[PDB]
Amino acid sequence: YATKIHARYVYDSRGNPTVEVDFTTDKGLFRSIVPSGAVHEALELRDGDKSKWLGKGVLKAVANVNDIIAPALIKAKIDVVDQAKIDEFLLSLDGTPNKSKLGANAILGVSLAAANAAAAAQGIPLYKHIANISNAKKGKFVLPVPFQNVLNGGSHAGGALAFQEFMIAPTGVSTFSEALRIGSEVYHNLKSLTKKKYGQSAGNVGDEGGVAPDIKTPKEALDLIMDAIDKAGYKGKVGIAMDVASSEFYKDGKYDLDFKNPESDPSKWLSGPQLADLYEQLISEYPIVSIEDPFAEDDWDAWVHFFERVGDKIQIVGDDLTVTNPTRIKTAIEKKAANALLLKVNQIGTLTESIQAANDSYAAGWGVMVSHRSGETEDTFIADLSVGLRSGQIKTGAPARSERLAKLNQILRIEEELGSEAIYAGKDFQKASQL
Amino acid sequence: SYATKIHARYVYDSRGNPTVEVDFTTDKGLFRSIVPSGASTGVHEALELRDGDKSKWLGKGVLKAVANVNDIIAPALIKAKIDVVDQAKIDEFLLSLDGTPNKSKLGANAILGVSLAAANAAAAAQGIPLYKHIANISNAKKGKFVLPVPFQNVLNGGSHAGGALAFQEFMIAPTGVSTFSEALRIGSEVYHNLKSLTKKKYGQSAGNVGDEGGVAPDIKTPKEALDLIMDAIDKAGYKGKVGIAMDVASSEFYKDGKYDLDFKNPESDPSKWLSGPQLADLYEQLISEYPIVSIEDPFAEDDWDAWVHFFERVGDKIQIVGDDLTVTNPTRIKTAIEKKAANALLLKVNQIGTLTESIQAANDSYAAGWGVMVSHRSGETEDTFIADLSVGLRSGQIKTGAPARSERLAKLNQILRIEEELGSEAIYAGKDFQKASQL
């Protein structure tokens, strides 16, 4: 099926090189771009030549595709519709467990481009191919709740605020079109309120499109967002999600909510139980629907205890905890540490393994939030992935840079194409695969 | 081949506001174009039609323009069965449907999407890349294709970024290398060095970006921004190989016949507002102090006397680019040519609204010995048309953002693909950017 496979480098949304693959069949040319990657994830290959792109070149990974993968896969004459055989072959070219000989970024571009070639071979949209090969439940397609970054903290902002991301989730409407419109309106009201309260510069955006004013406390951030939802006119219709990224402030088995302060008073660092009390207070006060990485990546007991406290009424999402890694995912399921997975395809390195991880999550009753990376591209693959996997949830940025909006625009085209055969996940996003 | 189906929808641009996207189907398949949108439009631009319904998208919906495509333009054009390779006949038909000089009946943002999609369908019908079709219909000189110098807006100010900085865009222009690929690599390395230097001098928040991907420090003088960029070039290792360009967008602070360099300060004192002559003297100092190769909109969009005076002083030393002055409009370019007000056109297809009129604007400029810089808007999309346009027109110059947000990199990535496709058949404009159409 594959008659020509060619890779090149292009630039990602932060100005760093990444791998793009042209995958040619008799049905035409199909292109994928790998987002930015990285002990638990598959390893992206960077060149390390400090004199070019500050060591971030990907000419070696590009060459691994053109010089090793392309002639091997072409010679194998594998039907691109058989995604599992394509990926099984890809993995046979690299014997390391983390794809470190060829590069996760070299392997993944080929995996994804073949999926695009296969959809066209069958005359179906990519999300329908993905629904087929992941064995999604038949019925109406489910369009995802966009979990939209609006406000950034932690490592991404000055001021004391320790939590890394605050997102809006427009769940209280009946269509994805309305959800995205309300999301854009709330985001614009938040930018306006941010500039007035924190100054004009505070309205300049970070890597994922959100703002990063100098905020002190979680309550201040959450109040700001609540103010934007109300001023935009959608009080009661917009949930809030947090990505705490608490590994960044885990110290001596406690949690330093002033970790950016070099004088941080250690007598105020919170135990596991005290941080759970704090989250439970915030849950009592705000329409928080999902919390990502509330406890540190290896603080397993803290996750399990917290999940028994709040797990039946809020989504708890592993990111640093699970790293789209089968062994870690199986651990978290068996421990009952969480009930939802961030799915980063370039953390695992092939589409088949990604679909496996998503299906193992669904089988445990977990949710799946298909996720962007900080270094994104104009590629829209994860939009079709979230629809095809029936995840009902996607995390792909603020509504404010086109490597973010390109995914959301693609779901707009999917929604229009499907018409009455699609359903917006709305408040049912946690269990959307079962709708 | 001719259109079999034409369908429009709204999508979201890089600022989160709706814009128009057109699906143009022929026997060769479906061709998609997306209309960009400026955050600060010149008063003479063709009309961008917005709905003004304040209960939806804060009045910035484009449902009317989308319905104008679906309900007026699409059935009429499909009926006419116009050969898509005949771009002028396509655009003449579109223009007849609207019948107004500024496209205010249907909206330039309903017309342009169809115009651009037609040209993509035309390239497919002929089995050639878009940039080659554009070279053909623009009657570009035959020979090597010319790849453009990427003018990268690495420090944002004015209406594109919160903070005190009056001038809208400070760009680097990596002219002192031999290939487009090297120019892009150097551009990214200078940008990353600039971001590091900016955060260490102005704080972490100053590394956040404006609309076009440039860093946005809260600085007050052009000298501060230019020193920062010079330091970034030097520390990256490319001293002497990178020119600087500015887009002043001076119409944004032209008030009472003077120029307010503190215009985002609501308490800006009118005593410090500069006259035309005072502003020209500041440019002359900056041109001497820094390797500035191009200045865009140095004076306001109808302040003809000041443009003429400034051109007399430095028109032989630097490129002087009309943007709001000319709005990619042949009638205003004629005035600028005859008055000797500038020597380059900023080509923004959506300021005039059809490809054919945009190409006429470029060819009128070339005929006067002017340069042409093909340009994005600050509200951009994943669309990559202007990459091929800059190559096809042989402009040697493109302005499509900093190497940061992907509505900017998408265009530069597309030029990387064109470069690789062309191989020895392409030349990098390099230091010859100003007269690249004659190379």
Author numbering:
A (entry chain B): 3 to 40, 44 to 440
B (entry chain A): 2 to 440
Q: Any passages from the paper?
A:
The protein Eno1 (encoded by the ENO1 gene [C1_08500C_A]) plays a crucial role in the survival, pathogenicity, and antifungal drug susceptibilities of C. albicans. First, Eno1 has enolase activity and plays an essential role in glycolysis (catalyzing the conversion of 2-phospho-d-glycerate [2-PG] to phosphoenolpyruvate) in C. albicans, as knocking out the ENO1 gene renders C. albicans inviable on media with glucose as the sole carbon source. Second, Eno1 has transglutaminase activity and an ability to bind host plasminogen (PLG) and thus plays a key role in the invasion and virulence of C. albicans. Enolase is a dimeric enzyme and is critical for glycolysis, where it catalyzes the conversion of 2-PG to phosphoenolpyruvate.
To investigate the mechanism of action, we solved the crystal structure of C. albicans Eno1(CaEno1) and then compared the difference between this structure and that of Eno1 from humans. The diffraction data show that in an asymmetric unit, four Eno1 proteins form two dimers. Two CaEno1 molecules form a homodimer face-to-face in an antiparallel manner. The β1 to β3 strand is exposed to the protein surface, and the rest of the β strands are embedded in the interior of Eno1. Interestingly the β4 to β13 strand forms a large β-barrel, while the α helices of the C-terminal domain are wrapped in the β-barrel to form a mixed α/β-barrel.
